[PDB]
From a paper:
Cilia and flagella associated protein 410 (CFAP410) is a protein localized at the basal body of cilia/flagella and plays essential roles in ciliogenesis.
Residues 1–138 fold into a canonical leucine-rich repeat (LRR), with five tandem repeats forming a calzone-like structure. The space between the α helices and the β strands constitutes the hydrophobic core of the LRR motif and is packed with many highly conserved leucine residues. Additionally, we found that residues 139–160 of TbCFAP410 forms a long hairpin-like loop, which is tightly packed on top of the helical surface of the LRR motif. All TbCFAP410 truncations with the intact loop were soluble, whereas those lacking parts or the whole loop, i.e., constructs covering residues 1–149 and 1–140, were all insoluble upon expression in E. coli. In the crystal structure of TbCFAP410-NTD there is an extensive surface patch across all five strands of the β sheet. Location of individual residues corresponding to the five disease-causing mutations in HsCFAP410 can be clearly visualized in TbCFAP410. These residues can be grouped into three categories, including one surface residue that is fully exposed to solvent (R75), two semi-exposed residues (V37 and Y107), and two hidden residues that are completely buried in the hydrophobic core of the structure (C63 and V111).
Author numbering: 0 to 160
The structure:
């Protein structure tokens, strides 16, 4: 019944710390994961690798203000608006979403850049100053857009709702 659910036990076995709040780096690639709600308390997580899982819903990551690098290659993210859960991540400089369905949506790269103001690199390609400027011209308001509802975060503050 916990098939696909990341558990506290598995995280703490792997990382050797006493609480989810003390997890700073976590690599759980290729673990058949579809539920990562346990990360709601991962307030100190900085480097997170979740590639090659079954994830479609990113709301738990609103609880991770320290996130610096986030690897999500080859998941099941189907809705571009899931990336709005990363809009308020002030320290997130590296993101990979390659091989999720959204990567083939028109204007995916511009949307992600315009949504995540801190980002310096997306999908293994650094974001140039002029690339960011152009993304904001196309999509000027994404930091104000409410992210989708989630079981695993409260509604983000400072959004049009």
């Amino acid at each position: 019944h916990m098939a696909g659910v990341l558990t506290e036990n598995l995280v703490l076995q792997k990382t050797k710390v006493d609480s989810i709040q003390r997890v700073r780096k976590l690599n759980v690639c290729a673990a058949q994961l579809s539920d990562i709600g346990v990360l709601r308390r991962a307030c100190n997580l900085e480097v997170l690798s979740l590639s090659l899982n079954e994830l479609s819903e990113l709301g738990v990551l609103e609880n991770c203000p320290r996130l610096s690098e986030l690897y999500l290659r080859k998941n099941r993210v189907e809705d571009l608006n899931q990336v709005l859960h990363l809009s308020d991540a002030p320290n997130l400089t590296v993101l990979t979403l390659t091989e999720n369905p959204i990567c083939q949506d028109p204007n995916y790269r511009r949307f992600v850049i315009a949504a995540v103001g801190s980002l310096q690199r997306l999908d293994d390609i650094d974001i140039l100053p002029q690339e960011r400027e152009e993304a904001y011209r196309v999509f000027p308001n994404l930091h104000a857009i409410a992210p989708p509802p989630s079981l695993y975060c409260d509604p983000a503050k400072g959004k049009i709702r």
